Enzyme design. Sequence first.
Site, PDB file in Angstrom:
ATOM      1  CG  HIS A  19      -1.911   1.110   1.281  1.00 53.09           C
ATOM      2  ND1 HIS A  19      -1.838   2.058   2.282  1.00 53.09           N
ATOM      3  CD2 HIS A  19      -2.984   1.448   0.522  1.00 53.09           C
ATOM      4  CE1 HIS A  19      -2.805   2.947   2.118  1.00 53.09           C
ATOM      5  NE2 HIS A  19      -3.508   2.601   1.054  1.00 53.09           N
ATOM      6  CD  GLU A  46      -2.889   1.782  -3.297  1.00 46.94           C
ATOM      7  OE1 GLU A  46      -1.945   2.143  -2.534  1.00 46.94           O
ATOM      8  OE2 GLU A  46      -3.797   2.563  -3.698  1.00 46.94           O
ATOM      9  CG  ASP A  48      -2.756   6.861  -3.441  1.00 48.94           C
ATOM     10  OD1 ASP A  48      -3.724   6.031  -3.371  1.00 48.94           O
ATOM     11  OD2 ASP A  48      -1.886   6.983  -2.534  1.00 48.94           O
ATOM     12  CG  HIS A  61      -3.002   9.654  -0.207  1.00 45.44           C
ATOM     13  ND1 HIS A  61      -3.642  10.525   0.650  1.00 45.44           N
ATOM     14  CD2 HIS A  61      -3.811   8.576  -0.326  1.00 45.44           C
ATOM     15  CE1 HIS A  61      -4.797  10.004   1.013  1.00 45.44           C
ATOM     16  NE2 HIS A  61      -4.925   8.822   0.436  1.00 45.44           N
ATOM     17  CD  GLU A 148      -7.473   5.808  -4.136  1.00 43.95           C
ATOM     18  OE1 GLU A 148      -8.101   6.792  -3.678  1.00 43.95           O
ATOM     19  OE2 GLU A 148      -6.981   4.906  -3.415  1.00 43.95           O
TER      20      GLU A 148
END
Length: 306
Positions: A19, A46, A48, A61, A148
């Site tokens: 993450h 993973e 962003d 993020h 994301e």
Amino acid sequence: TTRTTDNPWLDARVLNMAHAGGENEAPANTLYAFKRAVKLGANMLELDVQSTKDDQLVVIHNATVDQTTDGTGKVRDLTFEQVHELDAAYNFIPGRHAVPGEPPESYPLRGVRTGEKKPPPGYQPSDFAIPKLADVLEAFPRTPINIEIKGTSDADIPSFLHNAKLLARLLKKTGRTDFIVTSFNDLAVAKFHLLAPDIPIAPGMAGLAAYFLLGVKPMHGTVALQIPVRYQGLEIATPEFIRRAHADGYAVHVWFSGTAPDDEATYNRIIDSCADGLMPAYPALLERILDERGIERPGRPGVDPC
């Protein structure tokens, strides 16, 4: 005659999806964390994404650089050059992601980016900066990635849509399809799937509600349901709900992020709930858990936890 249903993500299990690279073991969303995490066994990344003033997709993020670096302001107000000068491990404190405002002694990796601590053996200063998605992609040509799409604001829908657009332009030129593209904002997911139809997606939060409460199947292209553990008091990562989602042909990828502890007890319980992937803040700890219980992995058969 109808093309048969083929979801490969039901055999990509069990997954260690670091993450943000593993925000408790390494500086979040840096090439260091990503390189560190794949070496320690993580099967998948993973991250962003946001955009800069000059429309570059950078891996980060928050809408502002304040929390994870020594700069300030929104990334959409800075050029890529200005974003990349920053020390993206300025505030990293192990076991706590990024906490500004502590004594300079708390931050083990503050200074590496700007050349005032030697980096860990085998890394360069740029591995501690906010990267470009393009530079993560070409660093990891055989590694699956979970991108994301982010925004400037929960109320700023066009900023999400702007980023979905830039994403689809660049992931189409890669020719790769070993991605899963999701967002909290469902429009950006729909915008992205219309521009890049071959790229596997996962529902935003409305599409996740409409399947968990009402049972309504998510948008075409949906490949898996990336869900939290708890949400609004309610449990979501239960064996019940995961079994119904495998019944509907979807893989399940659980994440944590303060909806539940990032610890062995939680990790193990979600592994027993038969989820197909975990997105831990501690990719090394999850990798010990998976190895000592001997649990099946992609290309490596083993104990099925359910």
